[PDB]
Structures are given as structure tokens and as C-alpha cells.
């Protein structure tokens, strides 16, 4: 699509293998903000949106958060708080045609807006000068912007990672739909409503989450930890020592409670 009326394709409920795109050498530039290009296979997300348009190497740098210029201000404006990455590759074989593409046109605006309209005689739409006989920084490039909305809904788009069985009553390093952490998973009697997937305590800390495949409600309690204090008579008397574990049950290695 043209940058004045870019396409927005919805991606949901599937397994996205990003290793093929990350390993592929076919991209001219691959600059990621938000997530690393090689770790995107492990994280899990709610939705993916693909903003597709053609621009030029000159001014192509404006597809980055908070940028200004004729294109960034009048055609496509990215928000300052962008959580996603922009990918670009040379598209000479598909988007360049001899003489000139007037098929692609370019026109501030709020982020992710869409204004397709027409109104000292001036009109707001201008045509792009795609020349295949010109300087290289003016030849059209196909750009696809992947904008990611995280926490907005249950996670549904994530990479190919083999699952394992779940182990109870031990602190384990878990990854549930992109939420990572350590703690002991036990059964709970908190009746979640069918549509809610995870619960958070005060100051954004997860207390429970609903697992996939068996849909049970597991409370997440951090595994027992504490400081180690040393009781010592002194280097002038003996090398005997005592250890105090502050207010925790040491059911995991005389012992006085």
C-alpha cells in the first residue's frame, strides 16, 4: 500500500517462527526496538499488526519513534512509546518501474492515524518520484512495521518452543505465555472468572495465572529465602559457629526452631 493509506493486517491465534526472518540475509536493514531480533522466538504476545508501505532510503530513518519530516508528520507517525520493530529490505524488483511510479503517493497527525482525503491552488496529495535511473537513495524500498501491543489481552502469537510437564511445590523458572518468574506453583481456591487469565498483587506482581492445556488456577508464591546471620563467640575463643535463618521453616537443608 501507499504510505498515505497503509495496510493493517491482523495476526492472531498462531505459532510465529521468527527464526526464519531473523536468520534471513534478504533484509537490507533490521533494527529492533523493544525486543532483540534473536530472543523474539521465546517471548509471547497478544497481537501483531503489520504496517506495510513503500518509502525511500532518504528519509527512511524517520520510521522510528517520535520522528519529524514531511512523511513522518503528514503520512505515518509512530508514537513516542513504541514497543515494536521496523524492518526494511530493497524492493527494486517489485516496487520500481521504468520512468516513474506514480502509483505510490505521499501526503501533524496522531499515532497510527489514517487520513485519506483530498481538498494559490494546492491539493494535499503529492506523487512519489520513483526513478530507476537516479541516485540510489531515491529508489523505493518496501518497509513493513510490526507494532506490538503487550499485556492488552491473553497472549496468542509466539514461537516454536516445546513444552514440558509441570512440577509442583518447588521453585522453578517458568515461562507462562511470555510471563517469566520463579516460585512454587500450588493449587489455590481463588475462583477466577472464565475470561481472566492472570492476577496481580499491589505494585504489579503476579499472584496467580491460569495455565493452558489443563486450565487450573495456580497461585505463585516465591520460594523460601532469607538472610544468613552468623553467631560467633570470637576468633579468640573457638572456631564454632551457628547460623540463623530468619523466620522461615527449614524443611530443606542440632536444629532448633
Amino acid at each position, epitope marked *: 500500500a501507499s504510505v498515505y493509506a497503509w495496510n493493517r493486517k491482523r495476526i492472531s491465534n498462531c505459532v510465529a517462527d521468527y527464526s526464519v526472518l531473523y536468520n534471513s540475509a534478504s533484509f537490507s536493514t533490521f533494527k529492533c526496538y523493544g525486543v532483540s531480533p534473536t530472543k523474539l522466538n521465546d517471548l509471547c504476545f497478544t497481537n501483531v499488526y503489520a504496517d506495510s508501505f513503500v518509502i525511500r532510503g532518504d528519509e527512511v530513518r524517520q520510521i522510528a519513534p517520535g520522528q519529524t519530516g514531511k512523511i513522518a508528520d503528514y503520512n505515518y507517525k509512530l508514537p513516542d512509546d513504541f514497543t515494536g520493530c521496523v524492518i526494511a529490505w*530493497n524492493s*527494486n*524488483n517489485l516496487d*520500481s*518501474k*521504468v*520512468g*516513474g*511510479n*506514480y*502509483n505510490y503517493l505521499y501526503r501533524n497527525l496522531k499515532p497510527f492515524e489514517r487520513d485519506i482525503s483530498t481538498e494559490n491552488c494546492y491539493f494535499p496529495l503529492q*506523487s512519489y518520484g520513483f526513478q*530507476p*535511473t537516479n541516485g540510489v537513495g531515491y529508489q523505493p524500498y518496501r518497509v513493513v512495521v510490526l507494532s506490538f501491543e503487550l499485556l492488552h489481552a491473553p497472549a496468542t502469537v509466539c514461537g516454536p518452543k516445546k513444552s514440558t510437564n509441570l512440577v509442583k511445590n518447588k521453585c522453578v523458572n517458568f515461562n507462562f505465555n511470555g510471563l517469566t518468574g520463579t516460585g512454587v506453583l500450588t493449587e489455590s481456591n481463588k475462583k477466577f472468572l472464565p475470561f481472566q487469565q492472570f492476577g496481580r498483587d499491589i505494585a504489579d506482581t503476579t499472584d496467580a495465572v491460569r495455565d493452558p492445556q489443563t486450565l487450573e488456577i495456580l497461585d505463585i508464591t516465591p520460594c523460601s529465602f532469607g538472610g544468613v546471620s552468623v553467631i560467633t563467640p570470637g576468633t579468640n575463643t573457638s572456631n564454632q559457629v551457628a547460623v540463623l535463618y530468619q523466620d522461615v521453616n527449614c524443611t530443606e537443608v542440632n536444629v532448633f526452631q
Partner: antibody
Amino acid sequence: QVQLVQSGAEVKKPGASVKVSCKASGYTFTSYAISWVRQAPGQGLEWMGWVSAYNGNTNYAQKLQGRVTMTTDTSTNTAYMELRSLRSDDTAIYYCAIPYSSVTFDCWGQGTLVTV
Amino acid sequence: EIVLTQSPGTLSLSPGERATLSCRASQSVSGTFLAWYQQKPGQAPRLLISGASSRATGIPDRFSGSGSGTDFTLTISRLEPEDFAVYYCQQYGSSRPTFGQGTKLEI
């Protein structure tokens, strides 16, 4: 669905002028720029020139400079080509052409033979 | 200016065997900025390959093109009776694009 019908064949005397039209339909005439190619019978193709259908900017060939002139009517979605002071060897099948879904070659016209 | 020369004007081959075509350039041309043309008798020229490697819509896999820089080659694996036509090579790397003179295939 895209069809381009050009004007009929022309027979003329040396030194005179000829204009060839090509009507366009089934696509946005302004969106795709027009291209002209000449092919003498038995010889190869030679590109003639470019004129965008949005603003009208110009890029002619040096060999044919000072003799060729293209204009386009956006209202009737029709492209024109004016050629003055013809000589004998310029007798050829003249095509109008826009690139569609391709870098070049798309929509070559049915051709117009100008006999000088 | 970049001039084109195709070494075989006509190739006389029985249908079924291997055919090769050449078309080289004088000054270096980017590989991407290339195409190849088949012009039937009495019909408009048709793009067989563009980008010097990639076929267009509706092109049989028997055709294929290759090469980069100045020297370029067109491949036809199996010769069918309808394939006997004229083929044009064209480069548009810088400024004016230059077309080919044509090569005819004979039974």
C-alpha cells in the same frame, strides 16, 4: 480487463508530421506513467521517451530530441504522441506502454504503423 | 551508452534438446535492474524473465535466466513446437534502457 486501443495506421510523405493516439481503460491513467517504443520491421526495439501522467515532467531521448512530443488527456484517459519531420527509415510499428505489476514491458499497444 | 550483442542469430534445433542464448553488455549493469523479452510473430513482446533470475506470471519452468554484471544467459530446457519465436534482451541499469536485436529458434 486492461485494454489499450491505439489509432489506425498512417501513410505520409517525407518531412511531414504525424500524431498517434492510444486510449486507455481499466486502470488509473494518472497512476502509471506511459512509455513509447519503436521497432522497425526486422530491427529491434528502441525506447522513445517518458512523460509522467501525474505532473507531466519530461525525459526525452537525445537521438530523437527536437522532433517528438507526448501529451496526455486525463479527462478522456488517452495518451498522445506528436512526431514532426519524419524520414524514410522511421517507418515502424509504434507502441504505447505502461508498466503494470512489472518493472517494464506491460501493456504494449496493438501498434501503429506510420509509413513515410 | 551500453550496447548489446546476441551471438546466435538463429539456432536450428530439433524439439527436445538443449538450447542456450547469450546477451552481454559493455558497461556493468546491476543484476536486479534487468529483464528478458519474448516477442511472438505479429504479437507484442512478452516478458519471460525479469530481475535476470525471476519469471513472470504464466511463464513455464522450462525457461530460466541467469547472469550478472555484463554477461547474461537465457536457458531453455525443453523445446516445444509452439516455443519457436524471437527473444529480446534488455537492461535498464542507468539512464536509457537498451533492447536486443532478437534470436530465432528453428525446428
